[PDB]
């Protein structure tokens, strides 16, 4: 039987969470996917010889901290924390997203990858060095992506799968 991985994509509105998820599932860039739709998407992919069923939650909508929302987010096994390289605020919000994940998982060691999206744009405001220094302080990988060109998309999701797999085999 295939191994199921529950991945959750988090980050500020408009950073490219939906475009990244759709690039992984469908291999095409979808410009302007409904900013309000939160949904889960499935992809069967073989990673390092293992047949994986990736169940990916693309977050959207209201910020809320109910017992239900916490319980739901806690089911995630690994998290992509996404910011956009042309939106400093989205990068500044990363500490918040990481803290919410650590809080509901009750752990300092949650599989996580920091993703700096929209690297195809020339309007960079978040330096690569500042972002990689933050990932280094967290002990997690940092991958720059472009959902528009597909650059780094497989690397970001498959690195997260490998982090979850490593966590389960400890
Ligand atoms: N209950 C649990 N939730 C979570 C979350 C979670 C989710 Cl799912 C949504 C939002 C969210 N939304 C989802 C998408 C993107 C933006 C918008 C609202 N639409 N927004 C904010 O923060 C937004 C800001 C601005 C206003 C005040 N906040 C604090 C900072 F200033 C940043 N955090 C969110 C968040 F952390 C993540 C991981 C977990 F494990 C848990 S557990
Ligand atoms: N140039 C560029 N635009 C992108 C990229 N990813 C997403 N976008 C655009 O940025 C906007 C927000 O993307 P979206 O996927 O809806 O982000 P979400 O709100 O995090 O789900 C849309 O206009 C997307 O088409 C990317 O890598 N490069
Ligand atoms: Mg979206």
Swiss-Prot record:
The modification N6-acetyllysine is found at residue 105. It is linked to Leukemia, acute myelogenous: A subtype of acute leukemia, a cancer of the white blood cells. AML is a malignant disease of bone marrow characterized by maturational arrest of hematopoietic precursors at an early stage of development. Clonal expansion of myeloid blasts occurs in bone marrow, blood, and other tissue. Myelogenous leukemias develop from changes in cells that normally produce neutrophils, basophils, eosinophils and monocytes. Leukemia, juvenile myelomonocytic: An aggressive pediatric myelodysplastic syndrome/myeloproliferative disorder characterized by malignant transformation in the hematopoietic stem cell compartment with proliferation of differentiated progeny. Patients have splenomegaly, enlarged lymph nodes, rashes, and hemorrhages. A motif (Effector region) lies at residues 33-41. It holds the Pfam family Ras. Ras proteins bind GDP/GTP and possess intrinsic GTPase activity. Plays an important role in the regulation of cell proliferation. Plays a role in promoting oncogenic events by inducing transcriptional silencing of tumor suppressor genes (TSGs) in colorectal cancer (CRC) cells in a ZNF304-dependent manner. PANTHER family: RAS, DI-RAS, AND RHEB FAMILY MEMBERS OF SMALL GTPASE SUPERFAMILY. Changing residue 6 to N: In GASC; found also in a patient with Costello syndrome; exhibits only minor alterations in its in vitro biochemical behavior compared to wild-type protein. This is GTPase KRas. Changing residue 60 to T: In GASC; also found in bladder cancer; somatic mutation. It is found in: Cell membrane; Endomembrane system; Cytoplasm, Cytosol. The lineage of its organism: Eukaryota, Metazoa, Chordata, Craniata, Vertebrata. It comes from Homo sapiens (Human). GO terms for cellular component: cytoplasm; cytoplasmic side of plasma membrane; cytosol; endoplasmic reticulum membrane; focal adhesion; Golgi membrane; membrane; mitochondrial outer membrane.
């Amino acid at each position: 039987g295939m191994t199921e991985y529950k991945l959750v994509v988090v980050g500020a509105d408009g950073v490219g969470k939906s475009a990244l998820t759709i690039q992984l599932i469908q291999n095409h860039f979808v410009d302007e996917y409904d900013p309000t739709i939160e949904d889960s998407y499935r992809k069967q992919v073989v990673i390092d010889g293992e047949t994986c069923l990736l169940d990916i939650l693309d977050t959207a909508g209201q910020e809320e901290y109910s017992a239900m929302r916490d319980q739901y987010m806690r089911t995630g096994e690994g998290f992509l924390c996404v910011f956009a390289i042309n939106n400093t605020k989205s990068f500044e919000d990363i500490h918040h997203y990481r803290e919410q994940i650590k809080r509901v998982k009750d752990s300092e060691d949650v599989p996580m990858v920091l993703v700096g999206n929209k690297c195809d744009l020339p309007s960079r405001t978040v330096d690569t060095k500042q972002a990689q220094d933050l990932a280094r302080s967290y002990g997690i990988p940092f991958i720059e992506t472009s959902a528009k060109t597909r650059q780094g998309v497989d690397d970001a999701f498959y690195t997260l799968v490998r982090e979850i797999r490593k966590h389960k085999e400890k």
